[PDB]
């Protein structure tokens, strides 16, 4: 919608962001091409933009960035050799050609696993050429997550750069740098899983359920706004999500900019925490708004019992506009409880809808739904207590031993799941507790909700491949709102037959003394799951003693001169003593 599309986007983004967004885009489309080849492609597109910035009437400056990036994909000589069918996409005319490329993006490309180099090597290269160090970082991540939103990844690179600038100028760099890198890698993987789950849930459960989720979250974010303003923001927010899932980078960035412009031009009627966000730049504004803290809940709100319990003309409004009346109930309840999780608010709204659906059809509706608010209390106290109990357990045991507590609990919950899946789930949940128990209780539940939603979905899609547990399949075949309580409601499997003993499962060698602290813990936790599977009726006292004996067994044999004999003699004694202690 401009005279020169490439010259305008270059001015809005600047040279810094333009180069990075083009680098991320090429790596996501052409995942198998080397790094230096993408660099030469970025500098060609970047230098062409500078011609249009100096004269918008120059050659090819009138063309949109889609067709300029499109035929630039068709300029590579190996197009058909590396990506067979893709070269035939180029015979199609835009827009029919850009959608042809989105098909070819490989979600799981055959590339080597990223091995983190030593701190000395990474920073001797970070100071050698700082811009090249960040470009390779973007190149290797973008071609392994082709659907990762590019400006989102661009913000990780800035945080990735701020760590190397700070950490590697301080003595004992690893104590500063490595925890910052592992923290990001976890948040980056969580961001990738969240972006994918937002799209998958939008298409699986329908646009109505997606809108209901946004109503609860935006009402928590913007409690001073009106239902008409919140309901409109939900429609536009869903419009942006529907467009952003299509895969187009520029279309998704433009819609995010439009919504950011509307919210910034109506601050006095939305929320008061946006004066700082609305002076940010084009890519920083939408990201800033999506992370804005909740505005102050208004003062002296009326009780929800008036418009939803203590009113004769209530069932009529439910039949007047069901989704609008329920939407008002979601809006009024969410704005007053920013400490509740969105899924929790959806349970209450679903419970309220289920009550009215049966109450109005009865003889006396008012006396039927008179105690509908009593049904909400057992649904609110359950997640409140669950978080409080586990945060006290985490504060007592620390992250590692807290994972071991979740390990035994879930392996006794469903022992049919494969061992690496239970370890991955229990470790990520321990990370969630380590991430959210730091916050006050008014922020613990919203903090844990987004992380727990993907963690249980990873378990579901992993267990979907090889179904072994009928209980896990049942809890996974539930609503996203009912999926979490389904797992927590499960008790220990009484009919689980213990698996036979395997010596190689509990046998350990001198190689365990060379891995890092993380992989070494993972090996103990893997044996902990297998120990529970073999003796599921074992008590917590009997398992804590074996785990404590395991720590001394690994600690002794790693400090010994003859580590080979130590792991063989002590392990042969440790297993025989543990097997005799349990029975």
């Amino acid at each position, epitope marked *: 919608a401009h005279k020169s599309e490439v010259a305008h986007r270059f001015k809005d983004l600047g040279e810094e962001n333009f180069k990075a967004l083009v680098l991320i885009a090429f790596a996501q489309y052409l995942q198998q091409c080397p790094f230096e080849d993408h660099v030469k492609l970025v500098n060609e597109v970047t230098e062409f933009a500078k011609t249009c910035v100096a004269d918008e009437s120059a050659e090819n400056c009138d063309k949109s960035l889609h067709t300029l990036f499109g035929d630039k994909l068709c300029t590579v000589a190996t197009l058909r050799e590396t990506y067979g069918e893709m070269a035939d996409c180029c015979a199609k005319q835009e827009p029919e050609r850009n959608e042809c490329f989105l098909q070819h993006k490989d979600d799981n490309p055959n590339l080597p696993r990223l091995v983190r180099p030593e701190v000395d090597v990474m920073c001797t290269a970070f100071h050698d050429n700082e811009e090249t160090f960040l470009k390779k970082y973007l190149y290797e991540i973008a071609r392994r997550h082709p659907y990762f939103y590019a400006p989102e990844l661009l913000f990780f690179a800035k945080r990735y750069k701020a760590a190397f600038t700070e950490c590697c100028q301080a003595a004992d760099k690893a104590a500063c740098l490595l925890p910052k890198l592992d923290e990001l890698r976890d948040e980056g993987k969580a961001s990738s899983a969240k972006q994918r789950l937002k799209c998958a849930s939008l298409q699986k459960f329908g646009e109505r359920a997606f809108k209901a989720w946004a109503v609860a979250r935006l009402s928590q974010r913007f409690p001073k706004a009106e239902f008409a303003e919140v309901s409109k923001l939900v429609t536009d927010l869903t419009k942006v999500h529907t467009e952003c899932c299509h895969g187009d980078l520029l279309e998704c960035a433009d819609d995010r900019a439009d919504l950011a412009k509307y919210i910034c031009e109506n601050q006095d009627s939305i929320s008061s925490k946006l004066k700082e966000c609305c002076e940010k730049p084009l890519l920083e504004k939408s990201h800033c708004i999506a992370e804005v803290e909740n505005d102050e809940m208004p003062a002296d709100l009326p009780s929800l019992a008036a418009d939803f319990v203590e009113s004769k003309d209530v069932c009529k409004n439910y039949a007047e506009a069901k989704d609008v009346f329920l939407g008002m109930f979601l809006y009024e309840y969410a704005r007053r409880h920013p400490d509740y999780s969105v899924v929790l608010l959806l349970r209450l709204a679903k419970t309220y809808e289920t009550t009215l659906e049966k109450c109005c059809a009865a003889a006396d509706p008012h006396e039927c739904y008179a105690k509908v608010f009593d049904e909400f209390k057992p649904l609110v106290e359950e997640p409140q207590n669950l978080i409080k109990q586990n945060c006290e357990l985490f504060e007592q045991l620390g992250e590692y031993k807290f994972q071991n507590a979740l390990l035994v609990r879930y392996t006794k919950k469903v022992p049919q799941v494969s061992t690496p899946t239970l370890v991955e789930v229990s470790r990520n949940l321990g990370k969630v507790g380590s991430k959210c128990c730091k916050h006050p209780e008014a922020k613990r539940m919203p903090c844990a909700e987004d992380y727990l939603s993907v963690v249980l979905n990873q378990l579901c899609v992993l267990h979907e491949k090889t179904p072994v547990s009928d209980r896990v399949t049942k809890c996974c075949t539930e609503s996203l709102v009912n999926r979490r309580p389904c797992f927590s409601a499960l008790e220990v499997d009484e009919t689980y037959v213990p698996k036979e003993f395997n010596a190689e499962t509990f046998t350990f060698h001198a190689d365990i003394c060379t891995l890092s602290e993380k992989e070494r813990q993972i090996k103990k936790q893997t044996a902990l799951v297998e120990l529970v599977k073999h003796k599921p009726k074992a008590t917590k006292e009997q398992l804590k003693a074996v785990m404590d004996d395991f720590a001394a067994f690994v600690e002794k044999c790693c400090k010994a001169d*003859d580590k080979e004999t130590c792991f063989a003699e002590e392990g042969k004694k440790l297993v025989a003593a543990s097997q005799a202690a349990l029975g």
Partner: nanobody
Amino acid sequence: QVQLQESGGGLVQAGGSLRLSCAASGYISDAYYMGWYRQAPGKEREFVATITHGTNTYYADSVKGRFTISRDNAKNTVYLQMNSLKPEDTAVYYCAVLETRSYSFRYWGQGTQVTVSS
């Protein structure tokens, strides 16, 4: 203390056999156990085989199934049987005496040389 001396090493060909002996000049108590280490050219010291209790044998992965270790408790001599020798086995072979509870070195040998040639 007690001295250790290795005997039986030399020049052998690939696929051949060789027997290494290691006699101690003193009584090896029921505590201490004896084993074998090797040091390839340009490589650090490496575990080979060890024996304790008189029947418990523990070998390294590269030599498992090819080397066999045994001890004559009354003769104060540990035996290392080598079969299906490979050129990678060319190293200086030491026999050592170690404590059981601590698994630490106590007595080192002089070291006999074994060279496997194609």
